[PDB]
């Protein structure tokens, strides 16, 4: 698809951090993700992206597709090593999350793997698109910085 593509050939948002293929988030939503993402660039110089895409073309699936985004836009580890990539397919209501190993380690698996398994696929079935990313973007965050868990919806 044009969208597969474009994603994957138009490399990384480096003024935004999110490339809304899909459409479903708002100018407001997109705003408030550049504030809370350059901070805590700023801070931890971890670079979170997050991408939501319609449908993929091809069969792989979010997290197959996450590792290609990951790969093709941060080609070593010295690019990628501190960059997350988030990936929300809406139409099948599924997310994964990638990254280098400093992004990975900062966040931990119990925060990656409930994230996936909750902010994103549960907000976006009810179609709050918005709070999907800006919840997980949050939850992340607060595991990054050694805050709270601010738990699942
Ligand atoms: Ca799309």
Known sequence: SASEFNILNDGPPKETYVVDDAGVLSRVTKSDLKKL??????????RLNFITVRKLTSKADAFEYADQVLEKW?????????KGIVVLITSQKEG????????????????????????????????????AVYSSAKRLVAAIDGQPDPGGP
């Open 74 to 82: 941060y080609p070593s580890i010295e690019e990628g090593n501190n």
């Open 96 to 131: 994964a999350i990638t990254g280098g190993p400093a992004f990975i380690e900062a966040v931990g698996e119990n925060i990656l793997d409930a994230t996936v398994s909750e902010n994103l696929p549960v907000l976006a079935t009810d179609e709050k698109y918005n709070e």
């Open 37 to 46: 993402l350059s901070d805590l660039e700023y801070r931890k110089k971890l």
